[PDB]
């Protein structure tokens, strides 16, 4: 039985996303606590000492910066190279489907002065795992994120680079390192012990025509090798005050970063996560499953940053959160389609291998919980509201 | 003093490209020798036990297939995986500038069932080295080719893969295998010493162009094989195969300087590459395409001659302006290197003037304001 929907009284987020005694999410408390307790000058000195520790004296890379060429990864790599005198190799786990602006931003990243190693996993395997994750979990990104989180550490192992810097805030407030990942390497020995897109590796090979090579790209970094090679993952948001709007204007100035030419569906923003077309369906699934769409996440980030008030947040959520993303829907349906030509085995496992709109909407219904949705000739039972 | 231009009597190529006693290029004789002496069934058997030797059982990659997702690299990876039961990692040294169809073909490659590791070198460094190679050698691809040739062996070392298979004919006919003072080493006609000294580069900027460590190659038993040794390589076959199995997309329009639509269509700078070879050697893209098709038996020397006469001297206008911008070394992106150039921002007039400085009078004669070739290939 699911929890009754309550909204946080600082941001516009709900308790459904996968609160304290004043009804405030941990996220608002961490942001507000950081906006008093953090001395950014002494964090700047810690960054300069970390760079001194790792900076390469020869012509080798001293730094791995993962990212898609979005405003955050652009800021991270650009400030590490041209302000802290680092030599980052940039590395990209490929999106499902490049947006035009997303591809231009990836190129602008490279053309700001960076080598880039882009890994694009087997497109057939990726589509099958994405379709399975949509069918089983209504979570297209589930397999993708397993590969993404593994990629940068594995790339540091391959190029024998020790330092990995993510252009985002730390996972644990106060700690610039993350290290938990070892539990991913164990998850194994058995058939139905490991899972991918809500399907066991055993049944992927058994029934969907996959082999162990098709899954090599998704395996986590070997923790023995990580420890052995002294690979350290750092979060640049620990060391530098991370402000998305600042990263946008910085990336426009120094890189020619291009915002989405039109408003991102489901939200009001134009420069948050704009490289992957399937991003649209990701926020539709979370909306369907948890009653909170993309405008909720964007407005919550902007309320904590101090760029908007909770009242403007509530107005934006009300206007945009329930918008369906039509622009790429048809390409995405084709991407999710498991045809006989490309998938001689896997295609037969699906009742409707070729996805259309009606099938996707029917599938969405099966993830729409009646404690969040009531029909109107659908509508949220509970929308975020302004404070009393 | 340069050699007087003679054309080969089998194909339509000249002796200027960087002949025997019947006036036949070595390339025509080697194609003739191959279409007689080669038992392709026995070459197929040799391929099957190259594959047996290297095939991986533990679900790791057992081979590296380099390429851009053009018809050849598509064929190589697709036939190795789906016919010879290999598990290739595909590997791409990025082009200067993706064509739209080129990028869609690279994606079609990945979506035919291949993991791909794409290396895109520092775009500023690449533009500066390409502009230098254009100024000094009239050879935009020179630094690109150094990096490209190094890439696949280095990738085999990184992923700890032993077998590298190029989707092309062998370099040496008959064998399928390939075998401190900064003012000594050169890149785009410029020494490493002067690149760092005067153009604002460091050792890291040039790391991507360094060759594979030969000690590491020998130690890890990395073998480069050429698939054209083992399989009868026919460009047009690779095209129709790649269309059938991958949705390979030809150029929507005829490639400038030639008649073809699916030979090397991924890099916009490919246009200027064939213009420079024409300017320096009197032979453009139609000469290379027609010569290949004459040896394959698909056209006669006379059709070749007609195609060279109509297409070889075409200037590639479609991407000219984007390429001039690509070669432009502005102050924002190159605060140091920009000042080294008399005209940092390239335009058409500067490119044409620079071309003139490479147009040798033993190959080109003026006719009013139109350059014409002193010697064009003839039917004979
Ligand atoms: Zn909150
Ligand atoms: Zn010849």
Residue numbers in the entry:
A (entry chain B): 37 to 54, 73 to 233, 235 to 242, 246 to 435, 438 to 448
B (entry chain A): 37 to 54, 73 to 233, 247 to 447
What did the article's authors report about this structure?
N-acetyl sugar amidotransferase (NASAT) is involved in the lipopolysaccharide (LPS) biosynthesis pathway that catalyzes the formation of the acetamido moiety (sugar-NC(=NH)CH3) on the O-chain. The reaction involves the ligation of ammonia with a sugar N-acetyl group, displacing water. The NASAT family belongs to the AANH_like (Adenine nucleotide alpha hydrolases-like) superfamily, whose domain forms an alpha/beta/alpha fold for Adenosine nucleotide binding. Members of the NASAT family carry a conserved PP-loop (SGGXDS, where X represents any residue), indicating that they may have ATP PPase activity.
LpNASAT folds into a compact basin-shaped architecture with an unusually wide and open putative substrate-binding pocket and a conserved zinc ion-binding tetracysteine motif. On the edge of the pocket, there is a conserved tetracysteine motif (Cys44, Cys47, Cys79 and Cys82) possibly indicative of a metal binding site. To confirm the identity of the metal, we conducted inductively coupled plasma mass spectroscopy (ICP-MS) experiments on highly purified LpNASAT, and the results showed that zinc appears to be the candidate among the transition metals under investigation. Two LpNASAT molecules in the asymmetric unit seem to form a dimer. PISA (Proteins, Interfaces, Structures and Assemblies) program analysis of protein the interfaces suggests that the dimer is likely to be stable in solution with a favorable interaction energy (ΔiG −3.9 kcal/mol), consistent with the results of size exclusion chromatography. At the bottom of the putative substrate-binding pocket, LpNASAT harbors a highly conserved PP-loop motif (122-SGGKDS-127) on a region between β1 and α3.
